[PDB]
Design a protein around this ligand. Structure first.
Ligand SMILES: [Ca+2]
Ligand SMILES: [Ca+2]
Ligand SMILES: [Ca+2]
Length: 637
């Protein structure tokens, strides 16, 4: 490159990884020094343009040449944005004579962008253990029955006139005539999870557990809460939970662990004493009397049968959060004995909350996604972080969760349906996560990913819950038509991408399953061993991710987007390691010349494909590797 009235896009690069940003999570007194990469001697000037919310105006910071990379192929220009408490957004203007290019979260542009700027949010911190960990999601009733004495038997009890039904382990989840799918039980419990911690923390290596609802509720999913302060008897009691927590936190049975609980705060079940639709308590619930001490906890259109609920389901009456200081806000998060604080404080000390139907939380029966909803989550953050600054807050949202993350006053992250689950599904299986036809090419996949990462601040990106499947969508293995190799590819991408790899129990071995309730099948422990290739690969991948910080908090750079051979390659790198991931989404093998020079891997240096164990030497800035169809290589050094 040279000063030739042309900015070479291929040489440009910036993101908030270690090599380019010295303060990704700054306080009000820390300045932010940024570095922009370009080909050596390619430009004449560069400037940082940032919007400051402190004065609603743009500010200009001229950059200066700082250094060359070790290979002498690139230049690094630098500029610093001043320290202050205000949120700021930035982009770069890059000039080479008569040629100008712009660059921000969305990459290079010939024209100045108006969106996708990088974020600077002073004092906003997400838990580092979340950024660096691997999560395992468990639907309690279907993981493992560690205590048969608490099992719900067929006819054990009835709910809304329907008796419960117990299924043999491994059998179908669909309820038989006279029963209901939501009242089917296999016997999975907390004691079971506790007894299988070795599998989770050692066999696989995951250090974060996320559990679907565990509090008293009549259903098998338990999103229809009856008592937030008590573990459902079928899963055990509060002492069992305490024991499980201690074993998860223990460092004697593997890596230190973390527990995230499912917080269902938008609504309660219709059998909760505050509501008590079936009069299961001597006290008078809102449904029973307009004089009930909890009457105002809900919103009635026509008392008592017409009330606000979750998506119109009468079994899930919606909680009225009222205004700040309300009793409802108190019992959910403000009070020391609230649901949120009780479990975050001793003797439980859980590590986080996954916020169910978070977008809907509101006052007066309103639909959320409004000022009040955001005000509530802001108060929620203060409540939670006040008890434990390292307690995670992950909200459920299926689209762009920027509204609950980008201001650094609400959630730490969200369920990444839009930025991970969906694109991965359509690229690899050609189906959306609902198993309907929807396919995208490699170039489209790469673009989709970049755009969704750009929706979030960097620390949020690194903290996103990235799962292949979950309890509300079809199983990845079903969308893939049972092709195990498609799972291999998905796992490799998942374990090397930006955000918390989250394994939906069973996905690690290829468990299949259609739409709810079929996506909640019981776990087969004979398939949960290294003898299953997917399980063996999962363990290997987790070990690989835990070995390289670059995979968890390093930069991300696209290297290859080949729609002809269906090859996708990207690099993850920081001050120490440089890793080039090469994925083959085709049905046949392909030998790929990987442009590792882009990650500054020196000629003559060596890389090891952590997937196969084979070693290679960097020659002429390239690394040639053969990759099987629906498989990948992780070239690290
Ligand atoms: Ca040039
Ligand atoms: Ca049991
Ligand atoms: Ca009653």
């Amino acid at each position: 490159a040279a000063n030739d009235n042309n900015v070479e896009w291929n040489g440009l690069f910036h993101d908030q990884g270690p090599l380019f940003d010295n303060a990704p999570e700054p306080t009000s007194t820390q300045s932010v020094t940024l570095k922009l990469r370009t080909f050596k001697g390619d430009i004449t000037s560069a400037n940082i343009k940032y919007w400051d919310t402190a004065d609603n105006a743009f500010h200009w910071v001229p950059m200066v040449w700082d250094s060359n990379d070790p290979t002498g192929t690139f230049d690094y220009w630098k500029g610093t944005i001043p320290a202050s408490p205000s949120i700021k957004y930035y982009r770069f203007q890059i000039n080479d004579g008569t040629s100008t290019a712009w660059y921000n979260g969305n990459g290079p542009s010939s024209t100045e962008p108006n969106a996708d700027d990088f974020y600077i949010i002073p004092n906003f911190k997400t838990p580092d253990w979340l950024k660096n960990g691997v999560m395992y999601q468990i639907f309690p009733d279907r993981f493992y029955n560690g205590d048969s004495s608490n099992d719900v038997q067929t006819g054990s009890y009835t709910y809304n006139g329907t008796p419960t039904e117990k299924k043999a382990w491994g059998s179908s989840v669909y309820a038989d005539p006279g029963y209901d799918n939501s009242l089917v039980f296999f016997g999975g419990d907390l004691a079971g999870i506790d007894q299988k911690l070795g599998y989770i923390k050692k066999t696989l290596g995951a250090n974060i557990l996320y559990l679907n609802p565990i509090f008293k509720a009549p259903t098998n999913h338990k999103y229809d809460t009856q008592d937030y302060m008590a573990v459902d008897p079928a899963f055990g009691d509060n002492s069992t939970l305490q024991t499980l927590i201690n074993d998860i936190h223990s460092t004697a049975n593997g890596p230190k662990g973390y527990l995230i609980l499912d917080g269902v705060f938008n609504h309660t079940g219709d059998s909760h004493p505050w509501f008590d639709k079936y009069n299961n308590f001597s006290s008078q619930g809102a449904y029973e009397s307009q004089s009930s001490p909890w009457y105002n906890y809900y919103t009635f259109y026509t008392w008592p049968d017409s009330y606000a609920s979750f998506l119109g389901f009468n079994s899930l009456p919606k909680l009225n959060y009222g205004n700040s200081g309300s009793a409802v806000r108190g019992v959910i998060y403000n009070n020391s004995n609230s649901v949120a604080k009780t479990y975050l404080n001793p003797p439980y000390s859980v590590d986080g909350w996954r916020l169910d139907a978070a977008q809907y939380v509101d006052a007066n029966g309103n639909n959320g996604s409004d000022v009040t909803n955001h005000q509530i989550w802001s108060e929620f953050r203060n409540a939670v972080k006040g008890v434990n600054s390292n307690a995670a807050i992950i909200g459920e949202y299926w689209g762009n969760a920027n509204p609950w993350t980008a201001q650094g006053n609400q959630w730490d992250a969200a369920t990444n349906f839009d930025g991970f689950t969906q694109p991965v599904s359509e690229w690899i299986t050609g189906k959306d996560y609902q198993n309907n036809s929807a396919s995208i090419s490699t170039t489209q996949f790469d673009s989709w990913l970049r755009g969704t990462r750009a929706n979030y601040p960097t620390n949020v990106q690194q903290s996103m819950m990235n799962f292949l499947s979950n309890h509300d969508i079809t199983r990845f293995a079903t969308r893939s038509g049972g092709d195990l190799w498609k799972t291999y590819l998905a796992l490799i991408f998942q374990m090397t991408y930006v955000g918390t790899p989250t394994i939906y129990y069973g996905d690690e071995y290829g468990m299949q399953g259609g739409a709810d309730p079929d996506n909640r099948r019981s776990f087969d422990w004979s398939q949960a061993t290294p003898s299953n290739s997917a399980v063996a690969l999962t363990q290997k991948l987790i070990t690989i991710r835990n070995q390289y910080p670059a995979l968890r908090t390093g930069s991300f750079m696209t290297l290859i987007t080949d729609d002809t051979n269906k090859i996708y390659s990207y690099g993850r790198f920081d001050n120490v390691n440089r890793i080039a991931v090469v994925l083959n989404n085709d049905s046949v093998s392909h030998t790929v010349n990987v442009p590792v020079w882009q990650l500054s891997m020196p000629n003559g240096s060596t890389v090891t494909d952590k997937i196969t164990g084979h070693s290679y030497t960097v020659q002429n800035g390239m690394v040639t590797v053969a990759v099987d169809g629906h498989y990948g290589a992780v070239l690290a050094q």
